[PDB]
Amino acid sequence: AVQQNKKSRSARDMRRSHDALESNALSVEKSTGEVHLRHHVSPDGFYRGRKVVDK
Amino acid sequence: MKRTFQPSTLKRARVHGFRARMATKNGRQVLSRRRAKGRKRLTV
């Protein structure tokens, strides 16, 4: 099964009207002022104030 | 699945090599044709 008619560029872009990416939930640590994913250990290795991975 | 090319350099030489071509008159014609066209490789 295949198209009988080439899909128009308007119709192609209309299907893509649901393709937009969403932004993640970003939080800021208070011990360091560092940006991290909400509910995730910070890239430096802190979660809710304390260092957990210690690099 | 066995395919048509089963290489044997000895069989290749004895069927298509330079001395196989030079042995006959139609073989010499192949070498004349391939020299006239300018083939870099003459036989195999």
Partner: protein, 119 residues
């Protein structure tokens, strides 16, 4: 449906699933802090936490039960010599699952699994 069912398939056979979580729990007892996927870390709770509960009572039968479920002499020794005594007064919750980011290779949600008292 999976109404009220427990467990994660994790795209594995049950033999491989059993072998992997026994490997992971042994690794967690040795290192006290490991990184794995978040789905594996959440299912590792139900395997590794009953082993620490068992290790609180040191006996020949409990140690043999530990060895049947870990198949590791080092893990059995650590459970009854260190972890069983360390968590004697802790009523469960010996593990901590902390979400790290995502794996670079496949964007898999990562988690840190650490023993609660000291990792």
């Amino acid at each position: 449906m999976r109404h009220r069912k427990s467990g994660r398939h994790l795209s594995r056979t049950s033999a491989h699933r059993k072998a992997m979580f026994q490997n992971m729990a042994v690794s967690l007892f040795e290192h006290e802090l490991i990184k794995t996927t978040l789905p594996k870390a959440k299912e590792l709770r139900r395997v590794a936490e009953p082993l620490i509960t068992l290790a609180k009572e040191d006996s020949v039968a409990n140690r043999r039960l530990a060895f049947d479920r870990t198949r590791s002499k080092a893990a059995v020794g650590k459970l009854f010599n260190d972890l069983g005594k360390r968590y004697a007064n802790r009523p469960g919750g010996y593990l901590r699952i902390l979400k790290c980011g995502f794996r670079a290779g496949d964007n898999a949600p990562m988690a840190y699994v650490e023993l609660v008292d000291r990792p």
